[PDB]
Amino acid sequence: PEPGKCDEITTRGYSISMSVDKARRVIDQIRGRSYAETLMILELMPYRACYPIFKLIYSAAANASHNKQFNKANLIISKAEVNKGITLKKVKPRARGRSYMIKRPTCHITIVLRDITHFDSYDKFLESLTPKKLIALLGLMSTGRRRELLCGRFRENHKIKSFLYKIALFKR
Amino acid sequence: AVPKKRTSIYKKRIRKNIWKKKGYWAALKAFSLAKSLSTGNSKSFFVR
Amino acid sequence: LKAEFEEFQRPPNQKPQLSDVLPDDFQAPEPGTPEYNDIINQFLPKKGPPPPREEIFAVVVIGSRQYIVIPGRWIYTQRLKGATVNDKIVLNKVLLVGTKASTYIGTPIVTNAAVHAVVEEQLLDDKVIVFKYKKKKNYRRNIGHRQPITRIKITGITGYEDYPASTLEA
Amino acid sequence: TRVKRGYIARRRRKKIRFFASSFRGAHSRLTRTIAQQKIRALVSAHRDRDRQKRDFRRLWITRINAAIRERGVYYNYSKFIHDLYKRQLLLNRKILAQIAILNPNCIYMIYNEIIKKED
Amino acid sequence: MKHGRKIHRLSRPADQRRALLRGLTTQLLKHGRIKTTRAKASAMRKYVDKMITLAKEGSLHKRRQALGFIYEKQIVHALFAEVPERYGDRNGGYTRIIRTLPRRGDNAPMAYIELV
Amino acid sequence: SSRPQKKGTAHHMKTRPKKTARWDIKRGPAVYPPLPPLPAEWTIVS
Amino acid sequence: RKSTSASTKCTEEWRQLKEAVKKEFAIPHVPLDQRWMFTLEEATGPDIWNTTWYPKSADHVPTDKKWYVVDATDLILGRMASTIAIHIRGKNLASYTPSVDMGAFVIVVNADKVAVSGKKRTQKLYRRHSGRPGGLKEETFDQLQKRIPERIIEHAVRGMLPKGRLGRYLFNHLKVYKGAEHPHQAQQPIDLPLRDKRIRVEK
RNA sequence: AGGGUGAAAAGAACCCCCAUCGGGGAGUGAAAAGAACAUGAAACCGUAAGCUCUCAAGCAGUGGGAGGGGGACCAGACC
RNA sequence: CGGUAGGGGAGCGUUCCGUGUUAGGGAGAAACGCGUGCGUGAGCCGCGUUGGACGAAGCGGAAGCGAGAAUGUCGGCUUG
Ligand SMILES: [Mg+2]
């Protein structure tokens, strides 16, 4: 079926007491980074948000180890996002009988860790082939093995997708 | 003085991105510092 | 069955190996061999040669507009009243007949020239929104218009030969 | 019998919004704005279906002018056209402009006919 | 502006900043090493060295000048014992400053000032 | 100053363009000889 | 650093595949020189005869265009500048399009010998304004022509070019030199046709 | 002012991250519907993929459409 | 066969009632999302890797029956 089933662990923190903007400031830096680098960075960052985000990422790495069997060395943070949570309002008095509204923003954070090495067989093997060679090699195998070969990250990384549907190499 | 209008979506996204870029320079300092404490050779620095 | 096998193997065993989906049986056909070129012809076809048409074109008047018609091609016009699908019409207003050896220029019309066409369809055009609006007078009117249209195919341009040609002859 | 307005509103709105796809900014978001923007769109559209007919004639005439001015030192659009008419040819301006770009030799021929007869 | 104004303000008025510095140096001489903010450290150097250089001479005059800086007598006497022993050959420069991880509460840069 | 200006429609009356010259007024569309009768637009061939 | 890793290799190869197949089935370009009504290939294509011809990318490409030289000595400023504007704009080609640059390059040489009628040499006034108040500056035509004479013809032609993006981009096609010599000999300039009667002044 | 997890609490044993909260597996269940739980529009906040903006003046559209991309079966069309 | 104030003619839709404990519907209803479909338009007809139990058409009836403006109003969410 899809790459998302093979490579991915998803972890949601719910209701962290960071406001979405603050937390975003940290999450933008760790997007696309090796799990190692992201660790040490998040240990030494000045921001407050860094600590909850840290607990989160450590967790998601543990999940990829103990659940789906991945190597921690090969984890990168592939997709990370922060969405707004439930806002708690409180009213405080101002000068001269006026009030004002304080919001105590929460957030959900979603980190999606993605193994690099998984698929590497098909990956490098398909890199090995020139563009003609590959089409000659795919002239043998049934619809089954075609779909099984090319179901790696390959078609996306090199941007072949709409080309191969045009070469009649596939069915949708 | 007040805001005669409301700030348009895209411009606001640009200003807040500017404020998010400081996170980029902070992440660089943090990385360099980590690689300095990761050799245990610094006599100017201390951790416990 | 190789789909079920490789999917049950990518299901059961996580981290798939290349040797299982593609066995060591297939070397691929050599890049210079006929068995290579049949496949590479199938999947990457060479552009086929263009269909033959006459080298000729006419300029004909239909519904008081003037079209350039080349044979084998279909054009859109005003509905022709009392035309049915699969009708052989002849267009008799022909201003200009070009050929790459000749050009016939009517005064006004090329005499005896006829353009044989066949009415392939009767349509309604892409709906145009006619919209009448006046600010502050609180008046807007939304009205669609679909024009009836006739889609016809030019087959041949004939009966010019006798008429005097001119040429650029240097 | 109480009647909530229900979906009758949001269908209308949604069908309007479909129109306004690819409008920059809040012309693609807020319904209230989107309304106006829809009207103005439809309006300009109507206007320029009329401008169009003016404009291509503009164009064609211009191209014809250029195409002829190449031949004689003294020759114009005006002179040409006048001669097309006193020779009784019906070719309109779209056609002479298209034959000007796409078959330039043809227009040279036409000019040679007009001259021969005006001679 | 300030051109050539060399003093460390520590964001306190004169009175408080004096008292602060007296305090911090009695702490340094009592414990031998301490943890503070980089600013406070860099400022504290001068007065540490003043006390040390003071005790190298030992006269009743000098000792009275130290007593009127440091807060606790005991520390002063200890100084006028220890220093000729420990620092006799060191001509100036008696403090190490080893900086650390910043503070959690405010992100104030920290540091470790040692009596060397 | 004892003279006024021309505001609004007054000004338009004054300034709008006019051909005064008797020769340009009396002009007109060119007279072209009639066309020979033209054939039938489109005929049905059965 | 250009990575020669199998990945980027692969990608470039593939992209030349896409480009190859897109080139083979696409309709060929036939330039406009004795270009007859249609090629047997276009005949399968869209309808280009019953719509107005609009230029495609292969046409206007900068490297093609004509170059012209105007010797401006004893020419009359305005009358020449109109000609120049026409050619730069492209209004003299059958292929003219308002939205595109079909024009030529024009090289003006001897820009200090350009001639002007009547008292203009001393009367005509080139003004430019700082943007501060009291910031107005004025030159007579002659002060200008002794100081930086190219600016006179640039300033007269830029007036007659369209204004706005295409206008400015057009204005770069006007190359002006004060001496009788231009360093464009490589571009093989043709001379400029002038159909005006009054453009040549005689003393 | 604050209504609607499921038919039934069967309200999630056990392992992992783990100071708790929170989560990921396993297990329950027709479905996770997972307790802030039933359909879940808009504003608003983002994330990814396609095309594109840093000489530019503009109620932001519209008629013309360069170049680039996408899903087709009337492949000359549509987006 | 331009059109404001304004008058007349012809229609569409919403919820409910009659036909009706209707036709149809866990072989997926309402709703929600989509359309190279059809209307002068209000809208209709078709479609769904959403949704989980109702409910058309026709021929009629009734109204808490159609919203962008009320410094309207109540919730939600922005801007600063
Ligand atoms: Mg009070």
Ligand SMILES: [Mg+2]
């Ligand atoms: Mg207040």
Ligand SMILES: [Mg+2]
């Ligand atoms: Mg009114």
Ligand SMILES: [Mg+2]
């Ligand atoms: Mg009700």
Ligand SMILES: [Mg+2]
């Ligand atoms: Mg109501």
Ligand SMILES: [Mg+2]
């Ligand atoms: Mg658009």
Ligand SMILES: [Mg+2]
């Ligand atoms: Mg302060």
Ligand SMILES: [Mg+2]
């Ligand atoms: Mg005091």
Ligand SMILES: [Mg+2]
């Ligand atoms: Mg005090």
Ligand SMILES: [Mg+2]
């Ligand atoms: Mg000193």
Ligand SMILES: [Mg+2]
């Ligand atoms: Mg006056």
Ligand SMILES: [Mg+2]
């Ligand atoms: Mg005026």
Ligand SMILES: [Mg+2]
């Ligand atoms: Mg007149």
Ligand SMILES: [Mg+2]
């Ligand atoms: Mg659990």
Ligand SMILES: [Mg+2]
């Ligand atoms: Mg505890």
Ligand SMILES: [Mg+2]
């Ligand atoms: Mg728990």
Ligand SMILES: [Mg+2]
């Ligand atoms: Mg489970």
